[PDB]
């Protein structure tokens, strides 16, 4: 596998978005992964509607701003037959009535694939061959809110208690040697000011730090 991967360099990733005061990270993580897969299928990068997911996917088990799951989001897109563009269905960071219109849909999926749980090498292989991957992580620590740069390593991080959904867009390493100071390249949904540019380098191959490889998946397009 490549020593480094960065799907942003290849056109797979939309700009950093901001969920604001709505517990909708699961929706941003799912649209990030579907955006990468729809791009690989069509050559066209089109931002998808988190608000469509927040307002419409309660039947699949999501709870809007009260939380949800990326896999249930991909299940909604499958059952619904489509998912609207963000341009047509803007984000307002509150729970609202579903306004989905098929004429505005720009994405579809047939289900989703789960990465072998707990296995960072399985996630490295999925990232290298598929594109961006949705993942769950433990973001429940003040060090995460205040993160600015460098490889994030939180001693109290859990790989099982996962309260946040984010997007792995790549992996890399700091310094001349490919095997040390390794990290996952993670797109967050807290705006471009958080993390200096909205991304965080999470320690890689350090025992599934913060659970990045515990519950990783991507839509089937």
């Amino acid at each position: 596998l490549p020593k480094s991967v960065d799907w942003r360099k290849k056109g797979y990733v939309t700009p950093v978005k901001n969920q604001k005061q709505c517990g909708s990270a699961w929706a941003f993580s799912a649209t990030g992964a579907l955006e990468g897969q729809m791009f690989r299928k069509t050559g066209k990068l089109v931002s998808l509607s988190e608000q469509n997911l927040v307002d419409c996917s309660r039947p699949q088990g999501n709870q809007g701003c009260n939380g949800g799951f990326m896999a249930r989001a991909f299940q909604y897109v499958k059952e619904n037959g489509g998912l609207d563009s963000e341009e047509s269905y803007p984000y307002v960071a509150v729970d609202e009535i579903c306004k989905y219109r098929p004429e505005n849909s720009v994405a579809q999926d047939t289900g989703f694939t789960v990465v072998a749980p707990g296995k960072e090498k399985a996630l490295m292989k999925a990232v290298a061959t598929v594109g961006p991957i949705s993942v769950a992580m433990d973001a429940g620590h003040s060090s995460f809110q205040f993160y600015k740069s460098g490889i994030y390593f939180e001693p109290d991080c859990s790989s099982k208690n996962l309260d946040h959904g984010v997007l792995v867009v790549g992996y890399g390493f700091e310094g001349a040697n490919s095997q040390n100071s390794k990290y996952w390249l993670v797109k967050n949904s807290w705006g471009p000011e958080w993390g200096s540019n909205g991304y965080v380098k999470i320690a890689k191959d350090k025992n599934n730090h913060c659970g990045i490889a515990t519950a990783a998946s991507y839509p089937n397009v």
Partner: peptide
Amino acid sequence: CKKKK
């Protein structure tokens, strides 16, 4: 598991 807010 728990919801991913």
